[PDB]
Amino acid sequence: EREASIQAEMRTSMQYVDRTVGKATSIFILDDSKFKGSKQGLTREWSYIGLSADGKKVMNYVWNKQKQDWDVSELGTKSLYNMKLDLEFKTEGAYQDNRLISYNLTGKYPDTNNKLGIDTAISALNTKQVFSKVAKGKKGIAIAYRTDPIQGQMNIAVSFVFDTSGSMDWDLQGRNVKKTGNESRMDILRKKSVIMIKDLAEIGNISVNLVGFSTSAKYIQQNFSNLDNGTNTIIATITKRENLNPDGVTNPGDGLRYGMISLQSQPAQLKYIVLLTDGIPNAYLVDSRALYAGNRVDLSQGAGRVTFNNPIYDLSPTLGYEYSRLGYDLYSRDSITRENSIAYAGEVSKKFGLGIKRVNVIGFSGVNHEIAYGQSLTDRIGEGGMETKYVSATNEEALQKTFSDIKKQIQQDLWFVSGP
Ligand SMILES: [Cl-]
Ligand SMILES: [Mg+2]
């Protein structure tokens, strides 16, 4: 009967873990790629709990800061008879507003096959910033944590790229705001992106600029405002009504070009495009090289479109517009022009998207067919190799939810990259 106090020792060890875990303000569950025992591999300023190399002790590497090292201490009180241990952590949903965690701490007795310990014990955490870095179907055998915030996070740049075509004067259902009573799409976009800015502000260390696009793109605010120095200057731009004035067609490639090149010139380590469009892509710019012979066919007066038989997209870092370089279809019905408009955005993404963490695309229309190429546009932008995500917002509160979700997801990239 050496069992009785081995089981008591494992339980007290687990209470030790739960005690120190209960004081953490951020938690990462780790698999054996970022913890092997040791201190070889430990990311600085993160404290850790996990099993020894020999697998026989539960230990706690605490961050020193003043000695800038780890204070290797065993969590527990006594030997365990050179027994080898199995330690596993797991998130397990929530109880009210608390996130749950499960602990496993077992091991078979010397040279018996009697399992000892706790197969699973549920506890609750005091932080909502609990993250998993367990790839694969790996087990997850260790934890990294902090008890005080991470001081000095990364910088984040967000380029907003907003459709300003003429359709943005109608209401979400595509009816005239004078005959219905509703706000215009642009009215709703102004309000809901002001909200999104104040929400982004809370993350801290986060700058934004504003690109408009319709027939072609324009910087509404070209340089990046840090919100920690004031929400004020950009909210003035978004709500000033000589700005974002609806007019033109839909040239998302050019908008994306302005967005991505301005992001390339920002130092931030997390970079984002938030692209909002309310219509079928129906415009693109060509390089001057494409102005030859019978390449440009001008059906503009009797069909409402100008197309290029062989488009060479305007991929220049020199940002310019000329009517002679414009492919477009005012009726958004010609399959070729639509294809060329979507492909332009993909070519722009491949050239200009190298540093970019994610492109979010928002289809913002209550009219089904106007956003029927939102996913298609996003997928083409995805050829540039970054993460992409398409969302449709068909009413005023879908948009505010999509904005909030995008904030929540940037906050989580930030947490995840500051992590161990
Ligand atoms: Cl998607
Ligand atoms: Mg439109």
Numbering used by the authors: 42 to 461
Can you list sentences taken from the study reporting this PDB entry?
The protein readily crystallized in multiple conditions, and after optimizing the best diffracting crystals, we collected a complete dataset on crystals forming in the space group P61. The vWA moiety of PilB adopts a canonical vWA fold, with a central β-sheet (composed of five parallel and one antiparallel β-strands) surrounded on both sides by a series of α-helices. The MIDAS motif in PilB, which is formed by residues conserved in vWA-containing proteins, noncontiguous in the sequence but in close proximity in the 3D structure, is functional since it coordinates a metal ion in the crystal. We have modeled the metal as Mg+2 because of its abundance in the growth medium and the high affinity of PilB for it. The Ser206, Ser208, Thr291, and Asp319 residues in the MIDAS motif of PilB form direct hydrogen bonds with the metal through oxygen atoms, while two additional coordination sites are provided by water molecules. However, PilB can only be accommodated at the tip of the filaments because the bulky vWA module sits on top of the pilin module in the PilB structure and essentially prevents other pilin subunits from being modeled above it.
PilB, one of the three minor pilins in S. sanguinis T4P, exhibits a canonical N-terminal class III signal peptide, the defining feature of type IV pilins.
